[PDB]
From a paper:
Several TCRs have been isolated from TILs of epithelial cancer patients that recognize a neoepitope corresponding to residues 168–176 of p53R175H. This neoepitope includes the arginine-to-histidine mutation at position 175 (HMTEVVRHC). The TCRs are restricted by the common MHC class I allele HLA-A*02:01. The structures reveal how oligoclonal TCRs 12-6, 38-10, and 1a2 discriminate between wild-type and mutated p53, and demonstrate that there are multiple distinct solutions to recognizing the p53R175H neoepitope with sufficient affinity to mediate tumor cell killing.
To assess ligand-induced conformational changes in the TCRs, we determined the structures of 12-6 and 1a2 in unbound form to 2.36 and 1.83 Å resolution, respectively (TCR 38-10 did not crystallize). Superposition of the VαVβ domains of free 12-6 onto those of 12-6 in complex with p53R175H–HLA-A2 revealed structural differences in the CDR3 loops. Whereas conformational adjustments in CDR3β were restricted mainly to shifts in side-chain orientation, CDR3α underwent a large movement (r.m.s.d. in α-carbon positions of 3.7 Å for residues 93–97), which allowed CDR3α Gly94 to hydrogen bond with P4 Glu and Arg65H, CDR3α Tyr95 to hydrogen bond with CDR3β Leu97 and contact the HLA-A2 α1 helix, and CDR3α Gln96 to hydrogen bond with Arg65H. CDR3α Tyr95 showed the largest individual displacement (6.5 Å in its α-carbon position).
Author numbering:
A (entry chain B): 3 to 39, 42 to 244
B (entry chain A): 2 to 125, 130 to 146, 148 to 178, 181 to 200
The structure:
Amino acid sequence: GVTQTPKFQVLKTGQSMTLQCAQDMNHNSMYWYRQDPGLRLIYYSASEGTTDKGEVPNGYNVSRLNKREFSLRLESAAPSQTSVYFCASSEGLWQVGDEQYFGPGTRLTVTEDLKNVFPPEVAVFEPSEAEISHTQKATLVCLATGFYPDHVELSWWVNGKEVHSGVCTDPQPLKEQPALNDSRYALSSRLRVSATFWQNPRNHFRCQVQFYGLSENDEWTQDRAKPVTQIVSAEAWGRA
Amino acid sequence: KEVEQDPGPFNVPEGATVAFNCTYSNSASQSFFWYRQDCRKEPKLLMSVYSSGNEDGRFTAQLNRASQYISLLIRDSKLSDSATYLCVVQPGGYQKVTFGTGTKLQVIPNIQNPDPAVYQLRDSKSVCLFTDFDSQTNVSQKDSDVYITDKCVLDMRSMDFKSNSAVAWSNKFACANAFNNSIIPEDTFFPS
């Protein structure tokens, strides 16, 4: 329906960037919103040839290129523009009952220094023997720790297949230092299986954290590894 | 900023009925919508709202133009209904559409056989797992070197079994003391 690129982005203060948005629904009207911990209209485009400021236009620019595409531009990013950005479209904002379809959104983080970006450390913690004895069930825990920005996706893979049954992931990464603006984050998930499942040594449990970070384009001078968009996994094996 | 909705968040037992209400100031308002938004995701149309009343399955919506409110009724709540529900108003004339701040819904399952326990798990150093506690136990946030997660529901579908858990960990520390700021039921299992 409504596509947005990129889905994730970390910028240095003062850098520029454009968020791209496309609808294949032949709508006239398109919008750009930001959402902060609701929705505020940045700018809108009522039809192909025109654009107009929304509630919070300061710091942004937009092109209505063609009927199909509506770009949002951040001239020079400021920390305050850290936010979730949603593109939307509608058949025509002048009609009674006009319905808006949202794009998936773009989580954008602005920091003073790209040295604050870190991929997650990932570890799998094995079921307690006491849990296994008491319940005849076994709960694994995956921890992703030390990452920034909080742009991660966690999934569980058992024997080469992605699983949802028995899985709980925290809705939200928590801040390791809630006071700090550059706090690094942590995310936990559980995966619970039967005792006999865990006790099969052939069973393979893999926690997979997708991290989104710096692009290839971004410049790195720090002694440590360039914190790029990457996947990190941690693994466990069954034990009788 | 002139649509006002339920503050929230709202806890509703699984299967029970949930009710949402929203007021709007502009009585010349033309169109009305309920949107639903999952955590870390985008808003989605749930339904249009008419004076007629409106029913799709478990969802009923009502507009009352005389009194300036809209409503949403959800029967037979599912765990999958957990989300934020945004009131949405299209004024139609000189103003932009307004989206409400939203009311957060958390549909809570019944745990028939609480088995509250705190287990310690080792790295394939260690974390603490509080689990199998009933849905009305509350897990609290106090130590800055102790990390405590909110309550999370997992669903072992093949066994038709739900259970709550919370994870805690620290660099400083024993599981016995990890969840003290929560009212932990006495007889919570603490393994040898």
